[PDB]
Design a protein around this ligand. Structure first.
Ligand SMILES: [Cl-]
Ligand SMILES: [Cl-]
Ligand SMILES: [Mg+2]
Ligand SMILES: [Mg+2]
Ligand SMILES: [Mg+2]
Ligand SMILES: [Mg+2]
Ligand SMILES: [Mg+2]
Ligand SMILES: [Mg+2]
Ligand SMILES: [Mg+2]
Ligand SMILES: [Mg+2]
Ligand SMILES: [Mg+2]
Ligand code: NA
Ligand code: NA
Ligand code: NA
Ligand code: NA
Ligand code: NA
Ligand code: NA
Lengths: 95, 156, 186, 140, 154
RNA sequence: CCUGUCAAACUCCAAACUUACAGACGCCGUUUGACGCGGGGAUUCCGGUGCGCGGGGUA
RNA sequence: AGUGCAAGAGCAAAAGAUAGCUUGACAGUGUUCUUCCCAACGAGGAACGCUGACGCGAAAGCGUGGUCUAGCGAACCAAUU
RNA sequence: UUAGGCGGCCACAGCGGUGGGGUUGCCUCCCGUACCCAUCCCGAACACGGAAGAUAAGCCCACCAGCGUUCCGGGGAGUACUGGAGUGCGCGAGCCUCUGGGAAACCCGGUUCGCCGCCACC
C-alpha cells in the first residue's frame, strides 16, 4: 500500500450505495444482544461512532459482555484471538 | 516507430485524461465521410471487419481511412455514399525514451482498441461497390487481417 | 423519484411525523417513553415500549374518555391535558410500568405547555420521569385559573353553551380527586 | 366548496434595498411596526464585501396591518399583468410585495405533518387578478 | 452410489484436491472406493473429477471386484461369501453388493477396508490426459464404462 | 430527436471466487493424547522455475 | 452547497447556517483495537468505560477538541508543577 | 383504523394524476389573543384559548402506470466472464474441448400507485 492508515483500501466497504444514503434507522442502533450470541460485524457507513477496524468487517463474533453502551465481541483474527468494542449499530444477529 | 510496439492488448486500460497530460492530438481528420447530410438510406451496406483483438494507432486509422475515402473518389468528390469509422483512439500509449530505472514511459500517442469481429469501417452504397475495393486498400494499412462483410445486399 | 440514485426519506419523515434524531436520543435511556400528543380539540398520553415489529403501547389515556369519569368541560386545555396525563399514568402503574422518559414529538418545549402538563400528571400518578419543575405551569394555570379569569372579561360567555358561564377550575379538582382512588379502568 | 377556495392576503412585505439604515424610520411609519435588518451574502465589488451587514430593512404586515397599508399602496401603483407571479402574487414599487393564497395554507407553514399545497389548490395569476381587481382598482 | 478410482498420481496435484481424495479413503493410484450419491459427496467427486474415474457399477461387476479386491479392516482374509456371511449382516457377496448399491450400508459398517486396492487395467486404460467424452479415461463413466474399467482391474 | 465511441485512479448493475461463523457428511483424536499451553535447540531472512492473475518495459 | 488542508469516505427537522450561552481542548485511571493482518515489537494514535469536577438542555442526552483516515520523537541532562 | 396516536421495513412506499368522504367519536382547515409562551418584524410559526363556518387543502378511502422503483415470464444467453483439467489448436496475440458455476445492457409481456406491528375508537 502507498500508506498504512486504518482506512487504507476501504473506499468500497465504508461507502454507501446512493439510495442507502443518509442517517440510518434507530431500531438497529438500540438492539440488545446477550453474552453468547453470534453477531456479524459490518460498519454502517452512515454511523460515525462505535466503529471497529475496517479489517474486521465480515467477521461473525460472539457477544461477551459490554463496555459502556458498547458491546464486547470476541473474534479470531487468522488464528489469533481478539476482543472488539463495537456498538449495536454495527452488529447483526446471526441466523 | 513500429506497430509491434503497441499492437497488442496486454496493458491495462489507460484512458483517464484527468490523470494523464501531454496527450498527442489525433491525426484522424473525419469520422463521417461522403454525404453525411443524408442518413443510411442506402440499398447496400458493406463493413470492414477486423479478425483479431488489436490496438490501432491513430496513425493507422488516418492512413487506413484516407486510403479508402481518397479512393472512394471513383465516385466523385460529392458522390452518393456515406463512409464511417466507428472507432476512436482512446487508449493512451507511452514509451520509455536512466535505462529501466523510473521506466514508466511518456505519452507518445493514442490507439483505439478493436476486438476481433468488430467492424471498424462501414460504408453505404447503392449497387455500386467500388467500396469493396476501398477496403482492400484499407485493411492494407492496419495490423490485423480483415473480413470485408456485406450486410443489406442480396443483389449478387 | 428522479433516478435510481435518488434518496427517499423514511416514510415517517416524509409525513413529517417522527423526528428520528430525537427518537434515538430518547430510546437511549432504555426506558418506556411517555408519548405526549395533542390535537386541536383533544390531548393523548401513551406509554410506549420497544418491540420486534414496532413500538408497543402498554397504557394510554385520551382527553375524550375523560368525560367517562365526569368531565363536562372542553378537552383541549391545560387541566384537560394534566388529568389525561395522570389518568394514563395510573393505568400505566396498573400495567406494572414504573418509569419513562417524556417524548413530546414535534412539539416545542415551551414552559408551562400542555405537554409538561401531561408529564406533571403522569408523574403524580406514580410514574418516575426525569423532569424539571420550573418548566411546568404554576398549578393554578393547571387547574384552569387562567381561563376562569379570561371569562371574567366576559360580556359574552367563553363557552358556547357548554357548561357554566364563569367556568370551573374546581371541576378540575373534583376530577383529579376522583382519579386518585378506586374507579374502573385504573 | 368556495369560501374555502376564495383568495385572501397573507403578508405584505415592504423592503428598502439600500446598499449599506436611516431608512428604517420611514418604513416604520408607512406601515406601523418595527423593521428588520437585511444582512447580505457574498463579497462583491460594490464595496459590499462584508458578509453579515445591514444593507436594508423589511416589514412583513399581516391582517389589517396589511390592508390598511395597501389601501394607499395600491393607489400609488398602476401596473398589472405580466407583473404577476405564477402563484398569484405581485411586487410593485421602495418595494411592496403582496403574497396571496387560499385558506388552507397553514398545512404548508405549520411544524407537524406539514405538506406542500397541491398545484390545484394553488392560486393562479388570473384567480389573483380577479380577487384584487375586485377590491378598489383595475387590472392591466 | 458411485465407484471412485484414482487414475493420476499425487505429484503436482493441488493439496486441497489430494486431501479430498484422502478423505474419500483413497491414498494410492488404482485404489478404489464406493461413494454414496449425496450433495456432500457430489461436491467432493466433482473437485476430484480430473484425476479420477467414477460412475455407477453394475451389480455383477461390483460383485466380482468385491470378491477379488475387498479386505477386512485388518489382515489378509479373503472376503468371499462365507467371510461375508460369517462376518456381515448379509448372507453372501451379492447381498452385500446390493446393500452398497442401494446405499443401505458401507464397507466400514460391515468391518471392511473402505478401499478396494485394484490391479492395473489389463490392456491399459484410455489415457489420463483426456476425459471420456474425449476418448480418455478421466471423469464420469457409463455403467458399461465403469464396468469395463473395473473388470479390467479386477 | 437522431447518430458514433470509452475508463486502473467511473458505477444504475454484476459473477465465478475468496472469506467470517454455524450445522451436516467426510476424515481425524481420546493406550499413536489430537486441539491447545509452557519451555530447550535450531536452521533461516541471495532463491528459482512452470501454470493462473497480474504492474512496469519495444522486448 | 457547506463542513480549515491531500484524496477517498460521512452528514439535511444535520455532522452544515444563524443566534445565544459555554470552555469536556477538564483532572485521574483503565479496557480494547491499531501501530505490527496473520504473528512478537516501543513511542504515537484511535475507539469504548469507570472515578471526580463541570457545561448545555425540559429531558432522554450530548461534550474524553475540530465528522473520519496525516499534523509526530527513546534514554542521558536541563527547566517547570 | 366513517378520517386517530406510536412505529418497523425504509420508493413494492417516489413523482404526477382522477373520483369519493364528515350535525361528531375523529383529524384538519378554521375563529380568536386575557393568560403560559412566542417572532433580531409580524398570534405567519411557536404557545394558549376556543367552535361561527367548511370538506376546498391536508388527512382517510377507492383507482390510473405516463416517469422513478421492486419482483416475475419469455427473448438476449447457457451468450460475456469464470474455479478445476488437457502431450487439444495457433508463429504468436490467443483460441478450443471436458468439468463445476454463470451475468449485464436492451426488447416484449406481467407486477408495483406500499406491506406489517402495538394501542385507541360505532
Ligand atoms: Cl477494532
Ligand atoms: Cl402532537
Ligand atoms: Mg476496489
Ligand atoms: Mg489392512
Ligand atoms: Mg502390456
Ligand atoms: Mg496412453
Ligand atoms: Mg481476493
Ligand atoms: Mg469526534
Ligand atoms: Mg546525549
Ligand atoms: Mg523547562
Ligand atoms: Mg374532496
Ligand atoms: Na444510511
Ligand atoms: Na540514474
Ligand atoms: Na493487415
Ligand atoms: Na501504544
Ligand atoms: Na442585529
Ligand atoms: Na377534506
Amino acid at each position: 500500500p502507498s500508506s498504512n492508515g486504518p482506512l487504507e483500501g476501504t473506499r468500497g466497504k465504508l461507502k454507501n450505495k446512493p439510495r442507502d444514503r443518509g442517517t440510518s434507522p434507530p431500531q438497529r442502533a438500540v438492539e440488545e444482544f446477550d453474552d453468547g450470541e453470534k453477531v456479524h460485524l459490518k460498519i454502517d457507513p452512515s454511523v460515525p461512532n462505535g466503529r471497529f477496524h475496517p479489517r474486521f468487517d465480515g467477521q461473525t463474533g460472539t457477544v461477551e459482555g459490554k463496555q459502556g453502551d458498547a458491546y464486547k465481541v470476541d473474534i479470531v483474527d487468522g488464528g489469533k484471538e481478539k476482543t472488539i468494542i463495537v456498538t449495536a449499530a454495527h452488529l447483526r444477529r446471526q441466523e | 516507430k513500429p506497430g509491434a510496439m503497441y499492437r497488442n492488448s496486454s496493458k491495462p486500460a489507460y484512458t483517464r485524461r484527468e490523470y494523464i497530460s501531454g496527450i498527442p492530438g489525433k491525426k484522424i481528420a473525419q469520422f463521417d465521410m461522403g454525404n453525411n447530410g443524408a442518413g443510411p438510406t442506402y440499398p447496400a451496406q458493406v463493413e470492414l471487419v477486423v479478425e483479431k483483438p488489436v490496438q490501432i494507432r491513430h496513425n493507422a486509422l488516418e492512413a487506413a481511412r484516407v486510403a479508402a475515402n481518397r479512393y472512394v473518389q471513383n465516385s466523385g468528390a460529392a458522390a452518393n455514399y456515406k463512409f464511417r469509422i466507428r472507432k476512436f483512439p482512446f487508449h493512451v500509449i507511452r514509451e520509455n525514451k536512466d535505462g529501466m530505472r523510473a521506466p514508466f514511459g511518456k505519452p507518445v500517442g493514442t490507439a483505439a482498441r478493436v476486438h476481433g469481429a468488430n467492424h471498424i469501417f462501414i460504408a453505404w452504397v447503392n449497387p455500386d461497390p467500388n467500396v469493396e475495393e476501398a477496403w482492400r486498400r484499407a485493411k492494407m494499412k492496419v495490423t490485423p487481417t480483415i473480413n470485408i462483410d456485406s450486410s443489406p445486399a442480396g443483389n449478387a | 423519484a428522479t433516478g435510481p440514485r435518488y434518496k427517499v426519506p423514511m416514510r415517517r419523515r416524509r409525513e413529517a411525523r417522527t423526528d428520528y434524531h430525537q427518537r434515538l436520543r430518547l430510546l437511549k435511556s432504555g426506558k418506556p417513553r411517555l408519548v405526549a400528543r395533542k390535537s386541536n380539540k383533544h390531548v393523548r398520553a401513551q406509554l410506549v415500549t420497544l418491540g420486534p415489529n414496532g413500538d408497543d403501547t402498554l397504557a394510554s389515556a385520551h382527553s375524550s374518555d375523560l368525560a367517562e369519569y365526569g368531565w363536562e368541560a372542553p378537552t383541549g386545555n391545560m387541566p384537560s391535558a394534566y388529568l389525561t396525563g395522570l389518568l394514563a399514568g395510573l393505568r400505566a402503574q396498573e400495567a406494572g410500568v414504573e418509569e419513562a422518559v417524556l417524548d413530546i414529538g414535534l412539539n416545542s418545549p415551551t414552559p408551562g405547555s400542555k405537554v409538561f402538563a401531561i408529564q406533571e400528571g403522569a408523574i403524580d400518578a406514580g410514574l418516575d420521569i426525569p423532569h424539571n419543575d420550573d418548566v411546568l405551569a404554576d398549578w393554578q394555570r393547571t387547574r384552569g385559573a387562567h381561563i376562569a379569569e379570561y371569562d371574567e372579561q366576559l360580556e359574552e360567555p367563553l363557552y358556547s353553551g357548554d357548561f357554566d358561564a364563569a367556568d370551573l377550575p374546581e371541576h378540575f379538582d373534583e376530577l383529579r380527586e376522583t382519579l386518585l382512588d378506586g374507579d374502573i379502568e385504573l | 366548496f368556495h369560501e374555502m377556495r376564495e383568495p385572501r392576503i397573507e403578508k405584505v412585505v415592504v423592503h428598502m434595498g439600500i446598499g449599506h439604515a436611516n431608512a428604517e424610520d420611514i418604513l416604520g411609519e408607512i406601515t406601523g411596526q418595527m423593521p428588520v435588518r437585511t444582512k447580505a451574502k457574498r463579497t462583491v465589488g460594490e464595496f459590499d464585501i462584508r458578509e453579515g451587514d445591514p444593507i436594508g430593512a423589511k416589514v412583513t404586515l399581516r391582517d389589517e396591518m396589511a390592508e390598511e397599508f395597501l389601501q394607499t399602496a395600491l393607489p400609488l401603483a398602476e401596473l398589472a399583468t405580466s407583473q404577476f407571479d405564477d402563484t398569484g402574487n405581485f411586487s410593485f414599487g421602495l418595494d411592496v410585495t403582496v403574497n396571496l393564497v387560499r385558506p388552507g395554507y397553514r398545512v404548508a407553514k405549520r411544524d407537524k405533518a406539514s405538506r406542500s399545497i397541491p398545484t390545484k389548490h394553488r392560486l393562479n395569476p388570473a384567480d389573483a387578478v380577479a380577487f384584487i381587481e375586485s377590491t378598489y382598482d383595475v387590472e392591466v | 452410489m458411485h465407484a471412485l478410482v484414482q487414475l493420476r498420481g499425487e505429484v503436482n496435484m493441488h493439496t486441497d484436491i489430494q486431501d479430498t481424495l484422502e478423505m474419500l479413503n483413497i491414498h494410492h493410484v488404482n485404489h478404489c472406493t464406493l461413494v454414496p450419491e449425496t450433495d456432500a459427496y457430489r461436491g467432493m467427486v466433482a473437485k476430484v473429477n480430473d484425476f479420477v474415474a467414477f460412475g455407477e457399477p453394475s451389480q455383477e461387476t461390483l460383485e466380482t471386484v468385491l470378491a477379488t479386491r475387498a479386505e477386512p479392516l485388518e489382515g489378509d482374509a479373503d472376503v468371499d461369501d462365507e467371510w461375508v456371511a460369517e462376518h456381515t449382516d448379509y448372507d453372501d457377496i451379492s447381498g452385500l453388493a446390493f446393500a452398497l448399491l442401494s446405499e443401505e450400508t458401507t464397507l466400514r459398517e460391515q468391518g471392511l477396508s473402505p478401499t478396494l486396492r485394484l490391479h492395473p487395467p489389463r490392456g491399459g486404460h484410455d489415457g489420463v490426459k483426456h476425459p471420456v467424452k474425449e476418448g480418455g479415461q478421466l471423469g464420469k463413466h457409463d455403467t458399461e464404462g465403469i464396468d469395463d474399467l473395473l473388470e479390467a482391474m479386477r
